[PDB]
PDB file of all heavy atoms in Angstrom:
ATOM      1  N   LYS A   5       8.774   7.795 -13.573  1.00 21.52           N
ATOM      2  CA  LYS A   5       8.113   6.649 -12.877  1.00 21.52           C
ATOM      3  C   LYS A   5       8.921   5.364 -13.096  1.00 21.52           C
ATOM      4  O   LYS A   5       9.368   5.077 -14.194  1.00 21.52           O
ATOM      5  CB  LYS A   5       6.695   6.466 -13.428  1.00 21.52           C
ATOM      6  CG  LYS A   5       5.717   6.263 -12.267  1.00 21.52           C
ATOM      7  CD  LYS A   5       4.529   5.417 -12.736  1.00 21.52           C
ATOM      8  CE  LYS A   5       4.927   3.940 -12.764  1.00 21.52           C
ATOM      9  NZ  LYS A   5       4.912   3.385 -11.380  1.00 21.52           N
ATOM     10  N   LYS A   6       9.102   4.592 -12.052  1.00 24.32           N
ATOM     11  CA  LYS A   6       9.875   3.308 -12.159  1.00 24.32           C
ATOM     12  C   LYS A   6       9.817   2.559 -10.818  1.00 24.32           C
ATOM     13  O   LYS A   6       9.716   1.345 -10.788  1.00 24.32           O
ATOM     14  CB  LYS A   6      11.339   3.597 -12.526  1.00 24.32           C
ATOM     15  CG  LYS A   6      11.897   4.728 -11.655  1.00 24.32           C
ATOM     16  CD  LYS A   6      13.259   5.166 -12.202  1.00 24.32           C
ATOM     17  CE  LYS A   6      13.645   6.517 -11.599  1.00 24.32           C
ATOM     18  NZ  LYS A   6      14.259   6.309 -10.256  1.00 24.32           N
ATOM     19  N   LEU A   7       9.874   3.283  -9.717  1.00 24.70           N
ATOM     20  CA  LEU A   7       9.815   2.659  -8.351  1.00 24.70           C
ATOM     21  C   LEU A   7      11.155   1.987  -8.015  1.00 24.70           C
ATOM     22  O   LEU A   7      11.652   1.160  -8.758  1.00 24.70           O
ATOM     23  CB  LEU A   7       8.674   1.627  -8.275  1.00 24.70           C
ATOM     24  CG  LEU A   7       7.380   2.220  -8.847  1.00 24.70           C
ATOM     25  CD1 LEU A   7       6.653   1.158  -9.676  1.00 24.70           C
ATOM     26  CD2 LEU A   7       6.472   2.674  -7.699  1.00 24.70           C
ATOM     27  N   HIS A   8      11.740   2.347  -6.890  1.00 24.55           N
ATOM     28  CA  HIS A   8      13.050   1.748  -6.476  1.00 24.55           C
ATOM     29  C   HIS A   8      12.800   0.377  -5.815  1.00 24.55           C
ATOM     30  O   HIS A   8      12.061  -0.426  -6.344  1.00 24.55           O
ATOM     31  CB  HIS A   8      13.757   2.703  -5.502  1.00 24.55           C
ATOM     32  CG  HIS A   8      14.158   3.962  -6.224  1.00 24.55           C
ATOM     33  ND1 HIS A   8      13.493   5.164  -6.040  1.00 24.55           N
ATOM     34  CD2 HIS A   8      15.156   4.222  -7.130  1.00 24.55           C
ATOM     35  CE1 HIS A   8      14.094   6.084  -6.816  1.00 24.55           C
ATOM     36  NE2 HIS A   8      15.113   5.563  -7.503  1.00 24.55           N
ATOM     37  N   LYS A   9      13.407   0.094  -4.675  1.00 22.63           N
ATOM     38  CA  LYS A   9      13.194  -1.233  -4.002  1.00 22.63           C
ATOM     39  C   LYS A   9      13.945  -1.256  -2.658  1.00 22.63           C
ATOM     40  O   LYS A   9      15.096  -0.864  -2.577  1.00 22.63           O
ATOM     41  CB  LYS A   9      13.708  -2.362  -4.910  1.00 22.63           C
ATOM     42  CG  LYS A   9      15.105  -2.018  -5.438  1.00 22.63           C
ATOM     43  CD  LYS A   9      15.993  -3.265  -5.402  1.00 22.63           C
ATOM     44  CE  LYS A   9      16.672  -3.452  -6.759  1.00 22.63           C
ATOM     45  NZ  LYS A   9      17.724  -4.504  -6.651  1.00 22.63           N
ATOM     46  N   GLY A  20      -6.216  -2.455  -0.237  1.00  6.28           N
ATOM     47  CA  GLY A  20      -5.446  -2.832  -1.467  1.00  6.28           C
ATOM     48  C   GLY A  20      -4.150  -2.014  -1.536  1.00  6.28           C
ATOM     49  O   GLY A  20      -3.102  -2.471  -1.116  1.00  6.28           O
ATOM     50  N   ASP A  21      -4.212  -0.808  -2.061  1.00  6.14           N
ATOM     51  CA  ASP A  21      -2.987   0.039  -2.155  1.00  6.14           C
ATOM     52  C   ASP A  21      -2.514   0.441  -0.757  1.00  6.14           C
ATOM     53  O   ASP A  21      -1.342   0.655  -0.551  1.00  6.14           O
ATOM     54  CB  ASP A  21      -3.290   1.319  -2.949  1.00  6.14           C
ATOM     55  CG  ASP A  21      -3.873   0.978  -4.336  1.00  6.14           C
ATOM     56  OD1 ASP A  21      -3.563  -0.083  -4.861  1.00  6.14           O
ATOM     57  OD2 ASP A  21      -4.614   1.795  -4.855  1.00  6.14           O
ATOM     58  N   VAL A  23      -1.136  -0.038   2.760  1.00  3.28           N
ATOM     59  CA  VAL A  23      -0.423  -1.148   3.475  1.00  3.28           C
ATOM     60  C   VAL A  23       0.521  -0.579   4.542  1.00  3.28           C
ATOM     61  O   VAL A  23       1.223   0.388   4.307  1.00  3.28           O
ATOM     62  CB  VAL A  23       0.383  -1.975   2.463  1.00  3.28           C
ATOM     63  CG1 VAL A  23      -0.565  -2.858   1.649  1.00  3.28           C
ATOM     64  CG2 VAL A  23       1.149  -1.043   1.516  1.00  3.28           C
ATOM     65  N   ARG A  35       0.174   4.173  -0.049  1.00  4.30           N
ATOM     66  CA  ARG A  35      -1.026   3.967  -0.925  1.00  4.30           C
ATOM     67  C   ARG A  35      -0.657   4.158  -2.405  1.00  4.30           C
ATOM     68  O   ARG A  35      -1.144   3.440  -3.253  1.00  4.30           O
ATOM     69  CB  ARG A  35      -2.138   4.960  -0.542  1.00  4.30           C
ATOM     70  CG  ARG A  35      -1.563   6.373  -0.421  1.00  4.30           C
ATOM     71  CD  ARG A  35      -2.680   7.418  -0.525  1.00  4.30           C
ATOM     72  NE  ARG A  35      -3.663   7.237   0.581  1.00  4.30           N
ATOM     73  CZ  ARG A  35      -4.449   8.225   0.923  1.00  4.30           C
ATOM     74  NH1 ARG A  35      -3.939   9.381   1.261  1.00  4.30           N
ATOM     75  NH2 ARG A  35      -5.744   8.053   0.940  1.00  4.30           N
ATOM     76  N   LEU A  36       0.180   5.127  -2.723  1.00  5.39           N
ATOM     77  CA  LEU A  36       0.563   5.383  -4.152  1.00  5.39           C
ATOM     78  C   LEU A  36      -0.679   5.892  -4.902  1.00  5.39           C
ATOM     79  O   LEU A  36      -0.874   7.086  -5.043  1.00  5.39           O
ATOM     80  CB  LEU A  36       1.092   4.088  -4.793  1.00  5.39           C
ATOM     81  CG  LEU A  36       1.569   4.362  -6.222  1.00  5.39           C
ATOM     82  CD1 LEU A  36       2.756   3.452  -6.537  1.00  5.39           C
ATOM     83  CD2 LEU A  36       0.430   4.075  -7.206  1.00  5.39           C
ATOM     84  N   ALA A  58     -11.155  -8.031  -4.588  1.00  2.00           N
ATOM     85  CA  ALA A  58      -9.790  -8.253  -5.163  1.00  2.00           C
ATOM     86  C   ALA A  58      -8.732  -7.650  -4.234  1.00  2.00           C
ATOM     87  O   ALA A  58      -7.663  -8.208  -4.058  1.00  2.00           O
ATOM     88  CB  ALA A  58      -9.700  -7.590  -6.540  1.00  2.00           C
ATOM     89  N   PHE A  61      -7.291  -9.951  -1.464  1.00  2.00           N
ATOM     90  CA  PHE A  61      -6.152 -10.849  -1.835  1.00  2.00           C
ATOM     91  C   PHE A  61      -4.860 -10.024  -1.853  1.00  2.00           C
ATOM     92  O   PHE A  61      -3.806 -10.497  -1.475  1.00  2.00           O
ATOM     93  CB  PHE A  61      -6.403 -11.455  -3.221  1.00  2.00           C
ATOM     94  CG  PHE A  61      -7.738 -12.164  -3.229  1.00  2.00           C
ATOM     95  CD1 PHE A  61      -8.795 -11.657  -3.995  1.00  2.00           C
ATOM     96  CD2 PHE A  61      -7.921 -13.323  -2.465  1.00  2.00           C
ATOM     97  CE1 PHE A  61     -10.033 -12.310  -3.999  1.00  2.00           C
ATOM     98  CE2 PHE A  61      -9.160 -13.975  -2.467  1.00  2.00           C
ATOM     99  CZ  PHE A  61     -10.216 -13.470  -3.235  1.00  2.00           C
ATOM    100  N   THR A  62      -4.955  -8.776  -2.261  1.00  2.00           N
ATOM    101  CA  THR A  62      -3.758  -7.877  -2.277  1.00  2.00           C
ATOM    102  C   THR A  62      -3.272  -7.692  -0.831  1.00  2.00           C
ATOM    103  O   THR A  62      -2.095  -7.502  -0.578  1.00  2.00           O
ATOM    104  CB  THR A  62      -4.154  -6.516  -2.873  1.00  2.00           C
ATOM    105  OG1 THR A  62      -4.542  -6.686  -4.230  1.00  2.00           O
ATOM    106  CG2 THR A  62      -2.972  -5.547  -2.797  1.00  2.00           C
ATOM    107  N   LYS A  63      -4.183  -7.769   0.117  1.00  2.00           N
ATOM    108  CA  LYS A  63      -3.822  -7.627   1.559  1.00  2.00           C
ATOM    109  C   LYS A  63      -2.911  -8.787   1.973  1.00  2.00           C
ATOM    110  O   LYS A  63      -2.111  -8.663   2.885  1.00  2.00           O
ATOM    111  CB  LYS A  63      -5.105  -7.687   2.396  1.00  2.00           C
ATOM    112  CG  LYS A  63      -5.063  -6.633   3.500  1.00  2.00           C
ATOM    113  CD  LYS A  63      -6.491  -6.309   3.944  1.00  2.00           C
ATOM    114  CE  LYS A  63      -6.989  -5.076   3.192  1.00  2.00           C
ATOM    115  NZ  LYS A  63      -7.325  -5.437   1.784  1.00  2.00           N
ATOM    116  N   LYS A  64      -3.041  -9.918   1.317  1.00  2.00           N
ATOM    117  CA  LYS A  64      -2.206 -11.102   1.668  1.00  2.00           C
ATOM    118  C   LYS A  64      -0.769 -10.897   1.202  1.00  2.00           C
ATOM    119  O   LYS A  64       0.155 -11.323   1.864  1.00  2.00           O
ATOM    120  CB  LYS A  64      -2.789 -12.354   1.013  1.00  2.00           C
ATOM    121  CG  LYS A  64      -3.881 -12.928   1.913  1.00  2.00           C
ATOM    122  CD  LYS A  64      -5.253 -12.567   1.337  1.00  2.00           C
ATOM    123  CE  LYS A  64      -6.272 -12.444   2.473  1.00  2.00           C
ATOM    124  NZ  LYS A  64      -6.207 -11.072   3.058  1.00  2.00           N
ATOM    125  N   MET A  65      -0.560 -10.231   0.092  1.00  2.00           N
ATOM    126  CA  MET A  65       0.836  -9.982  -0.378  1.00  2.00           C
ATOM    127  C   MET A  65       1.429  -8.866   0.497  1.00  2.00           C
ATOM    128  O   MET A  65       1.840  -7.823   0.017  1.00  2.00           O
ATOM    129  CB  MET A  65       0.808  -9.560  -1.853  1.00  2.00           C
ATOM    130  CG  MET A  65       1.057 -10.781  -2.740  1.00  2.00           C
ATOM    131  SD  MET A  65      -0.198 -12.043  -2.399  1.00  2.00           S
ATOM    132  CE  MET A  65       0.855 -13.167  -1.447  1.00  2.00           C
ATOM    133  N   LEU A  66       1.441  -9.089   1.796  1.00  2.00           N
ATOM    134  CA  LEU A  66       1.952  -8.079   2.756  1.00  2.00           C
ATOM    135  C   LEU A  66       1.802  -8.589   4.203  1.00  2.00           C
ATOM    136  O   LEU A  66       2.568  -8.213   5.067  1.00  2.00           O
ATOM    137  CB  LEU A  66       1.124  -6.803   2.608  1.00  2.00           C
ATOM    138  CG  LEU A  66       1.836  -5.648   3.295  1.00  2.00           C
ATOM    139  CD1 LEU A  66       2.298  -4.652   2.235  1.00  2.00           C
ATOM    140  CD2 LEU A  66       0.866  -4.968   4.263  1.00  2.00           C
ATOM    141  N   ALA A  69       4.412 -11.619   3.817  1.00  2.00           N
ATOM    142  CA  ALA A  69       5.604 -11.419   2.940  1.00  2.00           C
ATOM    143  C   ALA A  69       6.833 -11.134   3.811  1.00  2.00           C
ATOM    144  O   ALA A  69       6.870 -10.168   4.553  1.00  2.00           O
ATOM    145  CB  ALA A  69       5.354 -10.244   1.989  1.00  2.00           C
ATOM    146  N   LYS A  71      10.374 -11.272   2.538  1.00  2.00           N
ATOM    147  CA  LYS A  71      11.271 -10.437   1.685  1.00  2.00           C
ATOM    148  C   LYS A  71      10.414  -9.354   1.037  1.00  2.00           C
ATOM    149  O   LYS A  71       9.460  -9.657   0.344  1.00  2.00           O
ATOM    150  CB  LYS A  71      11.906 -11.303   0.594  1.00  2.00           C
ATOM    151  CG  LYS A  71      13.084 -12.090   1.178  1.00  2.00           C
ATOM    152  CD  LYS A  71      14.390 -11.332   0.920  1.00  2.00           C
ATOM    153  CE  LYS A  71      15.395 -12.256   0.226  1.00  2.00           C
ATOM    154  NZ  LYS A  71      16.169 -13.016   1.250  1.00  2.00           N
ATOM    155  N   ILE A  72      10.733  -8.101   1.252  1.00  2.00           N
ATOM    156  CA  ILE A  72       9.921  -7.018   0.650  1.00  2.00           C
ATOM    157  C   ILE A  72      10.853  -6.096  -0.116  1.00  2.00           C
ATOM    158  O   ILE A  72      12.047  -6.094   0.092  1.00  2.00           O
ATOM    159  CB  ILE A  72       9.198  -6.229   1.760  1.00  2.00           C
ATOM    160  CG1 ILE A  72       8.323  -7.178   2.596  1.00  2.00           C
ATOM    161  CG2 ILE A  72       8.314  -5.141   1.139  1.00  2.00           C
ATOM    162  CD1 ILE A  72       7.748  -6.434   3.803  1.00  2.00           C
ATOM    163  N   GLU A  73      10.314  -5.311  -0.992  1.00  2.00           N
ATOM    164  CA  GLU A  73      11.154  -4.367  -1.759  1.00  2.00           C
ATOM    165  C   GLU A  73      10.302  -3.130  -2.037  1.00  2.00           C
ATOM    166  O   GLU A  73      10.052  -2.782  -3.175  1.00  2.00           O
ATOM    167  CB  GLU A  73      11.622  -5.011  -3.075  1.00  2.00           C
ATOM    168  CG  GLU A  73      12.714  -6.060  -2.799  1.00  2.00           C
ATOM    169  CD  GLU A  73      13.940  -5.415  -2.122  1.00  2.00           C
ATOM    170  OE1 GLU A  73      14.386  -4.380  -2.588  1.00  2.00           O
ATOM    171  OE2 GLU A  73      14.421  -5.981  -1.154  1.00  2.00           O
ATOM    172  N   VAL A  74       9.843  -2.477  -0.983  1.00  2.00           N
ATOM    173  CA  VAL A  74       8.983  -1.252  -1.143  1.00  2.00           C
ATOM    174  C   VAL A  74       9.572  -0.390  -2.260  1.00  2.00           C
ATOM    175  O   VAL A  74      10.606   0.235  -2.101  1.00  2.00           O
ATOM    176  CB  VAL A  74       8.900  -0.418   0.158  1.00  2.00           C
ATOM    177  CG1 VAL A  74       7.435  -0.237   0.540  1.00  2.00           C
ATOM    178  CG2 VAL A  74       9.617  -1.099   1.329  1.00  2.00           C
ATOM    179  N   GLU A  75       8.932  -0.390  -3.402  1.00  2.00           N
ATOM    180  CA  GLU A  75       9.456   0.390  -4.558  1.00  2.00           C
ATOM    181  C   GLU A  75       8.830   1.785  -4.572  1.00  2.00           C
ATOM    182  O   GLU A  75       7.669   1.956  -4.900  1.00  2.00           O
ATOM    183  CB  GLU A  75       9.127  -0.349  -5.860  1.00  2.00           C
ATOM    184  CG  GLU A  75       9.696  -1.774  -5.812  1.00  2.00           C
ATOM    185  CD  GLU A  75       9.952  -2.294  -7.237  1.00  2.00           C
ATOM    186  OE1 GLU A  75       9.087  -2.125  -8.083  1.00  2.00           O
ATOM    187  OE2 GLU A  75      11.012  -2.859  -7.454  1.00  2.00           O
ATOM    188  N   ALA A  90       3.389   4.912  -2.158  1.00  2.00           N
ATOM    189  CA  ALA A  90       4.215   3.975  -2.970  1.00  2.00           C
ATOM    190  C   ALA A  90       3.603   2.567  -2.922  1.00  2.00           C
ATOM    191  O   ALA A  90       2.550   2.353  -2.346  1.00  2.00           O
ATOM    192  CB  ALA A  90       5.631   3.940  -2.406  1.00  2.00           C
ATOM    193  N   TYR A  91       4.265   1.607  -3.524  1.00  2.00           N
ATOM    194  CA  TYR A  91       3.741   0.207  -3.523  1.00  2.00           C
ATOM    195  C   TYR A  91       4.745  -0.742  -2.876  1.00  2.00           C
ATOM    196  O   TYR A  91       5.940  -0.493  -2.852  1.00  2.00           O
ATOM    197  CB  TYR A  91       3.431  -0.237  -4.956  1.00  2.00           C
ATOM    198  CG  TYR A  91       2.028   0.209  -5.329  1.00  2.00           C
ATOM    199  CD1 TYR A  91       1.737   0.552  -6.653  1.00  2.00           C
ATOM    200  CD2 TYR A  91       1.023   0.292  -4.350  1.00  2.00           C
ATOM    201  CE1 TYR A  91       0.448   0.976  -6.999  1.00  2.00           C
ATOM    202  CE2 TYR A  91      -0.262   0.719  -4.696  1.00  2.00           C
ATOM    203  CZ  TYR A  91      -0.550   1.060  -6.022  1.00  2.00           C
ATOM    204  OH  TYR A  91      -1.815   1.487  -6.368  1.00  2.00           O
ATOM    205  N   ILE A  92       4.249  -1.830  -2.339  1.00  2.00           N
ATOM    206  CA  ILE A  92       5.131  -2.826  -1.668  1.00  2.00           C
ATOM    207  C   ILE A  92       5.368  -3.986  -2.629  1.00  2.00           C
ATOM    208  O   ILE A  92       4.462  -4.435  -3.312  1.00  2.00           O
ATOM    209  CB  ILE A  92       4.461  -3.343  -0.387  1.00  2.00           C
ATOM    210  CG1 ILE A  92       3.647  -2.220   0.277  1.00  2.00           C
ATOM    211  CG2 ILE A  92       5.531  -3.841   0.587  1.00  2.00           C
ATOM    212  CD1 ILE A  92       4.539  -1.005   0.553  1.00  2.00           C
ATOM    213  N   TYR A  93       6.584  -4.451  -2.708  1.00  2.00           N
ATOM    214  CA  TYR A  93       6.900  -5.559  -3.648  1.00  2.00           C
ATOM    215  C   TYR A  93       7.496  -6.732  -2.877  1.00  2.00           C
ATOM    216  O   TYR A  93       8.690  -6.983  -2.915  1.00  2.00           O
ATOM    217  CB  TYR A  93       7.880  -5.036  -4.700  1.00  2.00           C
ATOM    218  CG  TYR A  93       7.181  -3.985  -5.534  1.00  2.00           C
ATOM    219  CD1 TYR A  93       6.773  -2.775  -4.954  1.00  2.00           C
ATOM    220  CD2 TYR A  93       6.929  -4.226  -6.883  1.00  2.00           C
ATOM    221  CE1 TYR A  93       6.120  -1.818  -5.724  1.00  2.00           C
ATOM    222  CE2 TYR A  93       6.276  -3.271  -7.657  1.00  2.00           C
ATOM    223  CZ  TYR A  93       5.868  -2.062  -7.080  1.00  2.00           C
ATOM    224  OH  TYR A  93       5.219  -1.113  -7.844  1.00  2.00           O
ATOM    225  N   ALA A  94       6.663  -7.451  -2.164  1.00  2.00           N
ATOM    226  CA  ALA A  94       7.143  -8.597  -1.378  1.00  2.00           C
ATOM    227  C   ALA A  94       6.324  -9.845  -1.712  1.00  2.00           C
ATOM    228  O   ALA A  94       5.118  -9.780  -1.879  1.00  2.00           O
ATOM    229  CB  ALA A  94       6.977  -8.279   0.101  1.00  2.00           C
ATOM    230  N   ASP A  95       6.981 -10.976  -1.788  1.00  2.00           N
ATOM    231  CA  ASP A  95       6.285 -12.270  -2.093  1.00  2.00           C
ATOM    232  C   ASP A  95       5.355 -12.092  -3.302  1.00  2.00           C
ATOM    233  O   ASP A  95       4.165 -11.870  -3.162  1.00  2.00           O
ATOM    234  CB  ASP A  95       5.481 -12.717  -0.862  1.00  2.00           C
ATOM    235  CG  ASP A  95       6.407 -13.435   0.129  1.00  2.00           C
ATOM    236  OD1 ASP A  95       7.312 -12.793   0.644  1.00  2.00           O
ATOM    237  OD2 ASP A  95       6.194 -14.614   0.361  1.00  2.00           O
ATOM    238  N   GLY A  96       5.902 -12.176  -4.491  1.00  2.00           N
ATOM    239  CA  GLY A  96       5.075 -11.999  -5.724  1.00  2.00           C
ATOM    240  C   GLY A  96       5.538 -10.737  -6.459  1.00  2.00           C
ATOM    241  O   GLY A  96       5.581 -10.705  -7.676  1.00  2.00           O
ATOM    242  N   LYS A  97       5.890  -9.702  -5.718  1.00  2.00           N
ATOM    243  CA  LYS A  97       6.366  -8.421  -6.336  1.00  2.00           C
ATOM    244  C   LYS A  97       5.199  -7.680  -6.998  1.00  2.00           C
ATOM    245  O   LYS A  97       4.486  -8.228  -7.819  1.00  2.00           O
ATOM    246  CB  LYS A  97       7.452  -8.709  -7.381  1.00  2.00           C
ATOM    247  CG  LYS A  97       8.631  -7.755  -7.170  1.00  2.00           C
ATOM    248  CD  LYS A  97       9.502  -7.727  -8.428  1.00  2.00           C
ATOM    249  CE  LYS A  97      10.221  -6.379  -8.523  1.00  2.00           C
ATOM    250  NZ  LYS A  97      10.663  -6.145  -9.928  1.00  2.00           N
ATOM    251  N   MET A  98       5.008  -6.430  -6.632  1.00  2.00           N
ATOM    252  CA  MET A  98       3.899  -5.597  -7.207  1.00  2.00           C
ATOM    253  C   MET A  98       2.547  -6.008  -6.601  1.00  2.00           C
ATOM    254  O   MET A  98       1.519  -5.478  -6.979  1.00  2.00           O
ATOM    255  CB  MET A  98       3.856  -5.758  -8.733  1.00  2.00           C
ATOM    256  CG  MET A  98       3.405  -4.443  -9.376  1.00  2.00           C
ATOM    257  SD  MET A  98       3.536  -4.576 -11.176  1.00  2.00           S
ATOM    258  CE  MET A  98       1.983  -5.463 -11.454  1.00  2.00           C
ATOM    259  N   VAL A  99       2.545  -6.929  -5.654  1.00  2.00           N
ATOM    260  CA  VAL A  99       1.278  -7.376  -4.993  1.00  2.00           C
ATOM    261  C   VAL A  99       0.274  -7.979  -6.011  1.00  2.00           C
ATOM    262  O   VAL A  99      -0.835  -8.332  -5.645  1.00  2.00           O
ATOM    263  CB  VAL A  99       0.681  -6.165  -4.249  1.00  2.00           C
ATOM    264  CG1 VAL A  99      -0.545  -5.603  -4.983  1.00  2.00           C
ATOM    265  CG2 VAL A  99       0.273  -6.589  -2.836  1.00  2.00           C
ATOM    266  N   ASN A 100       0.647  -8.113  -7.272  1.00  2.00           N
ATOM    267  CA  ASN A 100      -0.290  -8.700  -8.287  1.00  2.00           C
ATOM    268  C   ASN A 100      -0.240 -10.242  -8.236  1.00  2.00           C
ATOM    269  O   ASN A 100      -0.017 -10.902  -9.237  1.00  2.00           O
ATOM    270  CB  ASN A 100       0.087  -8.188  -9.692  1.00  2.00           C
ATOM    271  CG  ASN A 100       1.440  -8.766 -10.133  1.00  2.00           C
ATOM    272  OD1 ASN A 100       2.425  -8.648  -9.434  1.00  2.00           O
ATOM    273  ND2 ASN A 100       1.528  -9.391 -11.277  1.00  2.00           N
ATOM    274  N   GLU A 101      -0.457 -10.822  -7.077  1.00  2.00           N
ATOM    275  CA  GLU A 101      -0.425 -12.314  -6.962  1.00  2.00           C
ATOM    276  C   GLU A 101      -1.665 -12.919  -7.633  1.00  2.00           C
ATOM    277  O   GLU A 101      -1.598 -13.987  -8.216  1.00  2.00           O
ATOM    278  CB  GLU A 101      -0.393 -12.716  -5.484  1.00  2.00           C
ATOM    279  CG  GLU A 101       0.297 -14.077  -5.338  1.00  2.00           C
ATOM    280  CD  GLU A 101       1.818 -13.887  -5.304  1.00  2.00           C
ATOM    281  OE1 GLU A 101       2.409 -13.795  -6.369  1.00  2.00           O
ATOM    282  OE2 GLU A 101       2.367 -13.839  -4.217  1.00  2.00           O
ATOM    283  N   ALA A 102      -2.793 -12.245  -7.558  1.00  3.06           N
ATOM    284  CA  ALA A 102      -4.039 -12.776  -8.193  1.00  3.06           C
ATOM    285  C   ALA A 102      -3.852 -12.844  -9.714  1.00  3.06           C
ATOM    286  O   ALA A 102      -3.715 -11.831 -10.378  1.00  3.06           O
ATOM    287  CB  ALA A 102      -5.218 -11.854  -7.860  1.00  3.06           C
ATOM    288  N   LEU A 103      -3.836 -14.036 -10.265  1.00  5.90           N
ATOM    289  CA  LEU A 103      -3.652 -14.193 -11.740  1.00  5.90           C
ATOM    290  C   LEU A 103      -4.864 -14.920 -12.343  1.00  5.90           C
ATOM    291  O   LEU A 103      -5.438 -14.390 -13.282  1.00  5.90           O
ATOM    292  CB  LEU A 103      -2.374 -15.000 -12.011  1.00  5.90           C
ATOM    293  CG  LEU A 103      -1.621 -14.390 -13.197  1.00  5.90           C
ATOM    294  CD1 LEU A 103      -0.651 -13.319 -12.693  1.00  5.90           C
ATOM    295  CD2 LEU A 103      -0.837 -15.489 -13.920  1.00  5.90           C
TER     296      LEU A 103
END
Side-chain angles (χ1 to χ4, degrees):
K5 225 208 79 78
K6 47 190 165 83
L7 312 140
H8 293 106
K9 47 139 130 169
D21 305 332
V23 285
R35 48 160 61 160
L36 184 147
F61 304 112
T62 296
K63 222 157 265 75
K64 275 103 210 85
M65 264 58 255
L66 195 112
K71 280 265 233 272
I72 303 173
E73 286 300 313
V74 236
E75 304 206 314
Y91 274 148
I92 325 304
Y93 294 66
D95 278 64
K97 227 197 153 200
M98 213 174 81
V99 106
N100 68 306
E101 207 83 276
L103 221 89

